[PDB]
Amino acid sequence: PLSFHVIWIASFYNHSWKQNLVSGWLSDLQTHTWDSNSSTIVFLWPWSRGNFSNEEWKELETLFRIRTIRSFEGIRRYAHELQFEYPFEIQVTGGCELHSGKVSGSFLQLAYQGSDFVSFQNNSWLPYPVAGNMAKHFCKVLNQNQHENDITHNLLSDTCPRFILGLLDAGKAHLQRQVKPEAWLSHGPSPGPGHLQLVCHVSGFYPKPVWVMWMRGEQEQQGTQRGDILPSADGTWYLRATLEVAAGEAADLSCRVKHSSLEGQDIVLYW
Amino acid sequence: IQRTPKIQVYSRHPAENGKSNFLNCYVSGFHPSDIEVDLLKNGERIEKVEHSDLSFSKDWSFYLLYYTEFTPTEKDEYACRVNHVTLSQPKIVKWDRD
């Protein structure tokens, strides 16, 4: 599925109070931040430059300088008429993606109070059906400046596809790396008298695709429930897989783990 | 819309009393973004805890990671306390190795 996108978070706590934050992401992994105190882009990894020159990054910096202030200052003055009420939040995401190693499409979507509001498609701003009349007015306003729309369209159409192929090949050795999990077993909460809950933790793995199952010999236990895959501060992943059993029938149980790092040798723990 | 937070606590490595480790607190699915997160040792705050940059999912809801070094002990109690406008009072989630 892999995509690249830039996000923008603006909040209008008070009349006296407001925050805004801009950053770039390659799926889950952060790669860029905008640093207002000095007014520059911040590369979080040495390969965050991709295949782009200083010349071009310089021009991209002029652009974000201008837009984030203008956009921010102008949503504040259009608020009274659009009937945005304090406090409120605005969110934007834009970028593009690849399906099987070729570019697939771009997007640019905007949200008000946690819900879809407007989107940018085929060189124009479009209103989201359930948002109603305030979303129509907002598009009326955003389409007036045809100049600024052609610039927005050239970022999504041309700059972004070149960027993501350059980013990915430059980050090759970090994204294609392989890291082996560890595993361990513990008691979970009892579902009721006469019964136990077995928990099996898997942690430290990269990449993300993993397989974990409770077993009786060769026979997979279909009561196995796996949870969410959760992040860990160093970049690797974490998971638990649980099973409820009558306590008389808990002998001869094991947890088995398969992952691309292990090179064929599955991890197996015995209860 | 307002959405209320989901709170998950976990350790990076299995507990071994007297050995350094990392305690995590993942807070996800909330809106709006205004939130207070703490990690507590014996119900008192922990200074210098670090967190990810604010980000959101495809359904617009926000998520954060909070984490810190810690050395678990036979008798020490560790938790995660969260406050959000969706909550009639602050919510605590204890870390239990079992």
Ligand SMILES: *[C@@H]1O[C@H](CO[C@@H]2O[C@@H](C)[C@@H](O)[C@@H](O)[C@@H]2O)[C@@H](O[C@@H]2O[C@H](CO)[C@@H](O)[C@H](O)[C@H]2NC(C)=O)[C@H](O)[C@H]1NC(C)=O
């Ligand atoms: C940055 O990279 C892109 C992508 O090119 C491909 O992926 C690279 C990592 C590398 O493997 C190249 O050999 C690949 O071609 C460049 O854009 C492409 O340019 C080629 C010609 O060399 C062209 O045939 C493609 O259509 C281009 N793809 C586009 C425009 O999406 C680009 O030139 C590189 N540099 C910059 C600054 O953009």
